[PDB]
Design a binder for these strands. Structure first.
Lengths: 50, 86
DNA sequence: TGCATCCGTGAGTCGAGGGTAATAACTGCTTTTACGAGCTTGCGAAAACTGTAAACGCTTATCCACCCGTGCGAT
């Protein structure tokens, strides 16, 4: 998502560096949203009302 | 003359918080996420009512729960009352 | 040495309600720019499946010492 950087990578570009998995990079990202989906989400739910 | 007589009464005589939380705030194993929800365990405080002689027969942690309670100061097998009040 | 033209001044807060209109050419001809149409890569998803150290419940192999299987004894 380009947080703290100046660019936007792909699954292939991140896959070019660490490991050459493709669907599990997409599954690493989808796992972290479940790691952040309603006790830590009490502060971030306030930014919904923009 | 009753409102006046009583406004002179200031003149004459007068001179566990961790219990009800949902279960996903403990970083448990996903093999238990198919175990706890199968028994319809919805509360953290319900999980202490369902003691260690109640949970083990679901298919697909008995020592791990004893570690996760002893880190944050709790116990298993408590007897609660008027719970859940919702 | 006046005389005549000229440049530059002129309090402060608010306030209300808003913005215009006179009149101006047609033709054929040639070059540029947009709009929709149809592909080509490629990139993020869905749905399966082959490598490991623990991965939910659960049997044994042991060792040993509290207790006591019993007997017999204590006054």
């Amino acid at each position: 998502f380009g947080i703290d950087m100046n660019t936007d990578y792909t699954l292939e570009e991140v896959g070019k560096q660490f490991d050459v998995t493709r669907e599990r990079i997409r599954q690493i990202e989808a796992k972290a949203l479940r790691k952040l989906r309603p006790s830590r989400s009490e502060v971030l739910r306030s930014f919904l009302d923009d | 003359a009753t409102i006046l007589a009583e406004q002179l009464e200031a003149f004459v005589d007068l001179r566990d918080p961790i219990l009800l939380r949902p279960v996903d705030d403990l970083e448990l194993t996903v093999r238990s996420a198919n175990c706890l929800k199968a028994e319809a365990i919805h509360y953290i405080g319900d999980l202490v009512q369902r003691t260690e002689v109640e949970l083990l027969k679901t298919p697909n942690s008995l020592t791990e729960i004893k570690d996760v309670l002893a880190s944050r100061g709790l116990s298993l097998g408590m007897r609660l009352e008027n719970w859940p009040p919702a």
